[PDB]
């Protein structure tokens, strides 16, 4: 019973019980779907509506880190935005500092470091989201998910949520070293159009980001005309 | 103290003297004030060898976990705006003109002058220290931008000579180094060979007649160099 409580505490098998169960609240989020290209990188986030009277834009799952980098939160949204509050604050060192755009690797695991932080002491609990880290900064375009254990992994394409393994299946079709950014904000929506429950989650959208060659390596909302 | 810091194409040129003076007297008489901060980023320190020498450390240091750490090599630029904030911070406390200079292969060579105040100003080419004050006309005059790597070399160490031949707080050797994509070339020119001094320079052989011996015309002839005559 008391192996669990904490994220202080291994268990036996050598694995933090706390940060498994923080991982699960991802994994019962809604879908997210990314793909770097040579363009730049894409990312697609399926966004539930509790409600019929919401706003366009709200509960906005993608935010800006910086003028070439931003986050997509597959999670709790609250969490998430903490991270994005932190990568910001790291981004905004770096150009303050050391006069750079960060760097995406380097963005990355700055916001690992920090998600992680919250898996070490019995104070704190773990995050409830997995950030996916789009740059496209010195090193290129570069595409990260920090996950709740603040593992950092780079990928060509990454799918988080409750249909992250169809979403995978889709991703895989495509050829990564061939599609640009203009194709992949079609396929990445269609892919999210697709594996999204019609009778469970009536009410959604799919917000649509990138940070490409087009959009002058600048991380922006996709326009609504491209999104279907 | 001399310090100056030219662009080329490729890359730059420090150079500086080697003086460090307690007013009156030369301390040091072979400083090295061109400082490493990263393999193809060096500073010129002037003022406050204390400060600068101090400043160059700290800032070195923090540039060397920078570039461990985004795995990666560090922009000059970052080097310059890491020594502002330092040279800002800490304006009323220290004393030190600092010219930071480098290679790095996105923006090339890149001279940055740092001055007392904490400003920093990316130039062509940057002059600081008692001696600076020689050279602004000395540039305006000969220095032509686009000069070869070998040029900008043997320009920068007339430079440094041409400073330290009038400035009594400069002097010493002359040394420079080369940062581009190239290994870095330091060289140290001693003052028995230095490009000019004025005791070499033919125009200030024949001495001021000042002395004059005691003559029955108002006819200036030489000094007076014998009692006899």
């Known amino acids: ?228 | 103290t001399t310090i100056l810091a030219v662009s080329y194409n490729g890359g730059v040129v420090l150079a500086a003297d080697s003086r460090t003076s307690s007013g009156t007297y030369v301390v040091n008489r072979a400083s090295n004030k061109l400082t490493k901060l990263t393999k193809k980023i060096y500073c010129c320190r002037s003022g406050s060898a204390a400060d600068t020498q101090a400043l160059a450390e700290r800032v070195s240091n923090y540039l060397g976990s920078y570039q461990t750490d985004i795995g990666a090599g560090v922009n000059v630029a970052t080097a310059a705006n890491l020594f502002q904030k330092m040279c800002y911070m800490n304006r009323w406390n220290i004393s030190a003109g600092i010219i930071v200079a480098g290679y790095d292969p996105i923006n090339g060579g890149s001279v940055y002058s740092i001055p007392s105040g904490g400003s920093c100003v990316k130039l062509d080419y940057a002059l600081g220290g008692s001696g600076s004050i020689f050279l602004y006309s000395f540039f305006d005059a000969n220095y032509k931008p686009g000069m070869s790597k070998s040029e900008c070399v043997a320009f920068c160490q007339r430079a440094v000579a041409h400073a330290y031949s009038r400035d009594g707080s400069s002097g010493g050797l002359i040394r420079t180094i080369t940062l581009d994509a190239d290994e870095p070339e330091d060289q140290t020119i001693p003052w028995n060979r230095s490009p000019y001094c004025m005791e070499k320079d033919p125009k200030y052989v024949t001495q001021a007649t000042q002395n004059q011996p005691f003559s029955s015309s108002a006819k200036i002839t030489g000094n007076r160099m014998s009692s006899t005559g």
């Open chain 1, 1 to 228: 019973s008391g192996h669990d409580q904490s994220t202080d505490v291994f268990s036996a098998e050598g694995r933090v019980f706390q940060v498994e169960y923080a991982g699960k609240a991802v994994d019962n989020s809604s879908t997210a779907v990314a793909a770097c290209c040579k363009d730049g990188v894409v990312v697609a986030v399926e966004k539930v509506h509790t409600s019929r009277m919401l706003e366009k834009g709200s509960n906005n799952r993608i935010h800006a880190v910086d003028r070439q980098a931003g986050i997509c939160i597959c999670g709790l949204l609250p969490d998430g935005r903490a991270i994005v509050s932190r990568a910001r604050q790291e981004a905004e060192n770096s150009r303050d500092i050391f006069a750079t755009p960060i760097r995406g690797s380097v963005l990355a695991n700055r916001v690992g470091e920090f998600m992680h932080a919250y898996t070490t002491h019995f104070a704190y609990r773990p995050f409830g989201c997995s950030a996916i880290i789009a740059s496209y900064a010195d090193d290129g375009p570069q595409l990260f998910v920090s996950d709740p254990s603040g593992t950092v992994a780079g990928y060509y394409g990454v799918a988080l949520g409750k249909a992250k393994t169809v979403a995978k299946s889709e991703l895989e079709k495509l050829d990564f070293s061939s599609l640009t950014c203009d194709e992949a904000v079609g396929k990445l929506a269609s892919i999210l159009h697709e594996v999204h429950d019609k009778q469970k989650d009536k009410l959604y959208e799919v917000e649509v980001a990138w940070v490409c060659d087009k959009s002058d390596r600048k991380f922006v909302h996709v326009p609504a005309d491209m999104v279907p």
